Amino acid sequence: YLKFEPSKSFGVVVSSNSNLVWSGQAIVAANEEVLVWDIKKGELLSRWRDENCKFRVTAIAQSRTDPDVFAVGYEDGSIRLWDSKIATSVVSFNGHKSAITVLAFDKTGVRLASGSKDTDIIVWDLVAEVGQYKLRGHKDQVTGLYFIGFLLTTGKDSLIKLWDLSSRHCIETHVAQANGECWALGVSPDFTGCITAGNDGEITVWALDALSQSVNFLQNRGTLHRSSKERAAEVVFHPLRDYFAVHGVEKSVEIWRIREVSDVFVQHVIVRTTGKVRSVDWALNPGVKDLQLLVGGTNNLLELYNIVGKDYNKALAVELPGHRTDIRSVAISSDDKMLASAANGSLKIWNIKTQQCIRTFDCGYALCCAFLPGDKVVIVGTKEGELQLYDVASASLLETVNAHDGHAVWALQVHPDGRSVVSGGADKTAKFWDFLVQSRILKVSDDILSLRFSPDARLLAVALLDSTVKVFFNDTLKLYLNLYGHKLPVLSMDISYDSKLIVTSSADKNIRIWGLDFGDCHKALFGHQDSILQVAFIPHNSDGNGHYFFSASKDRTIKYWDADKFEQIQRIDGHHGEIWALAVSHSGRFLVSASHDKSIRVWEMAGERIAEALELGMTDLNTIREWEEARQINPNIAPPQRNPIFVALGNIPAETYVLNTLQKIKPASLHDALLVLPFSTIPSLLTFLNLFAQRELNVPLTCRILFFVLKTHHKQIVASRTMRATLEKVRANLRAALRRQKDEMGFNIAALKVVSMQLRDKSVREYVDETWEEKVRKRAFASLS
Amino acid sequence: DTAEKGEVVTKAGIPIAKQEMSREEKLRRRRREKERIRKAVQSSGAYKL
Amino acid sequence: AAQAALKLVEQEQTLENYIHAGAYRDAIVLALQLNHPGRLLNLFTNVVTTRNPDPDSLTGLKAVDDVLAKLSDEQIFQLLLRLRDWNTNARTAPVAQRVLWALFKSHPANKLSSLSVKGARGHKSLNEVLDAIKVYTERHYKRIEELVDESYLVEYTLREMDAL
Amino acid sequence: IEELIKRRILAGEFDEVLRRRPDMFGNPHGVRRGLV
RNA sequence: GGAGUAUGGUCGCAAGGCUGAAAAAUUGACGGAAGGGCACCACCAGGGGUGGAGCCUGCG
RNA sequence: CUAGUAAGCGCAAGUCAUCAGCUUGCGUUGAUUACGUCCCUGCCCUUUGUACACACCGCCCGUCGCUACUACCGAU
Asked: Where is each U3 small nucleolar RNA-associated protein 13 C-terminal domain found (chain C) (predicted)?
């Protein structure tokens, strides 16, 4: 039951997320890991590969004033601070919910902003390693972040937002686009201006200055428009000269210069790139008078252009350590030391121990690929119905035949003896080519999807568009038998080395285990959330495991199964774009995995409560009056040093505290807790009520609890003495407060009587006639009895 | 039943506008209302590709 | 609609800044202009509870007194809608009491009679909303009245402690 | 018997007495007795 | 002869297997905090069995 | 186990199921001890409705689902 482990992972340069970085080194993001290459020589300097986290990362940031320490923001919402001196995440922050979108570093690098798709923005002390706080604006997700302290940010609702840092809330807002969406944010590093790129290609330009009155810092000094009316992706300034670059995801970037606003800024150049650029990045090099623009193109490429200052030239490039459009097929060698790699547009073969590409060919499309025994030569069936033949040694194309007209040849199977190949197309014919020439063709009902030989070259089986399978004899092409039951067309097949079993994978999210003697389905099995792409046995039962097999499925999953017990023995995660192809070692020692991830991987008490609150408020009043005596003696610095719980509650006054913590409880319980209070607690409560009346609030409550205290202890109060002055205070305060209230509302009802009668007099009658009977509320009052 | 247009009444009977409302209170009042409520053939190219 | 929305969000956030500042006067006037009574009520509660009132100001802020004296009739009327709600509540009643008290002390009853708004139709017309105000004020007046009739006890007991 | 219980509790039916109101007979529509 | 009621026997259908054992949801799924009501399967005052030895119905 | 109750004491019957290695009756004598409280343990029920005056209260909180819209990403 040897479980398998990802041993290698490669074939790739920058994924389709943003945030390229330059240092003469290029810092790009793989799927999970973050790797650095040299641009002069295409050798990667290193990788930053975290064994703990498997989420993709999409946010990459360099600390200003300190390189070699770098922040990354993942798909889950985590933050990792690494070094380049040593490939170690020094810290991780897990504060958001999903997909850290924008990062930000301090001018001094002690502070870090994290903006996410989950729309909340969390700042981070970088020496206390704490979520400092959490600015909450932004009805939808952030599309930009910058530090000034102060913060400027833009969110996808086309909303630009200026927060303070010391006083945690925003002070300025504007909209970029009334109906559109601000997508990108560009800041003058000298804090003079800001530009907002919105989805029409509209670049609104803004001037910036560096509270009871009208604060105004930003001004829309105008708007501009680029040529591309696409969603602009990113706008990057020159750190030194007066230039910047606008782009969306396109094969073009518009570099404009700095000298009305359209006069201020004109397009310097527009660089056409070979591919849709994902992310742009700046580079300046020591000793050049040029501009090193480092673009990372969505089709898995790196490009370096030189811009002259007072035309572009494709100066440097990185394409060879990975394919470019989408990997489709794989054929690992019989000695299992190299492998052919078949992508749309390209074919690259690679040595596995170097995990490094050795040869490269251009195709148009690559449906399927397979070397020929001896591994001298390789074969690709391609979308146009056609068939192309290359060799690995001279690195050339040998032959090419039109297998089908334009009927994409879906399946390719070398003969087990290795003197013929068979080819199955988007036509109704499966052809047979002995090497070559065409030995024999096969006419069927529908278009063939997949097929395979028998390891003992004795049978074959085909898997058709009709959700079915036709097992035929190898020698003569007679119907052995047929398979059904799959509701959707069977996508792949695989049979046992002893030709005793078949797994059949279809797009109906399940596989079938067939017994190959009369073809009884030994077990139908739903085991994948999506369309299972491919299935593969191990050839060798020399380990004693030959009826174990593997399933690659559209939910980014590989699953390891045993047919004999019909059980899941392992589950294989690790890719994040949908897997397309995979292959097993001839010895079965490992396996390679090709995905739309564009990677290949190799796998080996109540009153008591108010009593204490009263006590706390007494202490509060004591330190407050003492602080008053201090500040009255001298206006020197004097902190009141209230309780941590008061300052945790936001410096609220003690009276507010006690009234709130009393008003929380229900009335009956109030009656009883007020009852249960003891007499030492009484006069402090009296002083609180005195404060309440003097700063009157919830006056019926105050009177009520007052009278309760007095009646339940009417004797002990007239026993004591120190009550007397306090009771006089509460008498004066309460009597004046009640008088104030009553007099005001009595004024109110008086004036209301006046205006009501006057209104009636306005609304008496106008005409005078014989019918005076035109001269009243009513209510319903259902009663059941 | 006598509420204003952009605003809704509270259970306390206090006027709040949905615009002056916060998102958090919005979520919580949705939760309270729901709480009361609960108390009551294709191409092979597309297929393989 | 676009330029109106630009203005709206501008004034909305500047309102927010006023609230952060405690810029009470302009806060209230733009709060009236933006018609949102929760925040408006919060402001009213604070301004009747400043803890340092001008002894001459009817509300503790002569600026608020001035702007309510400078109110237009329609502003007055929508305010009255908010007032009748806050009078219906009895926790909010004193704050609901103080403002109309100044508001009555500001404007003459001839103007108050001659209020004519287009939004006076059905239940939300003048006689009715003032009527509801009348009844709820009556309830509270009764409440505080009997409350004072109770409160005389502390004078009695004080006189007793004088007797000893 | 555990099987039968399972069937009924899934397909929820019981032969329970219910709380029939005392005033179906005179209030066959069951009005609320307050404001209308 | 009519109308019913039963009763049994006859007859036709039901009685042709892409197949090989192990959802609904504007209403739902699951918590949590506070507050009440209760109970010799809770607290508290006690009482009283069995459980030690012998006899044996029963049950395992 | 909280009132003719715990317990004691015998006397009889022998009821279509059970029960004589006992069941079930009837009478006889008859106490102590709490008779309160949700603190522990729990169990249930509030936070919707089902009636209006006085009176009082005053927008519970969490993680997800389903729905409409918005825009994004990548194959065909």
From this structure: 12-161
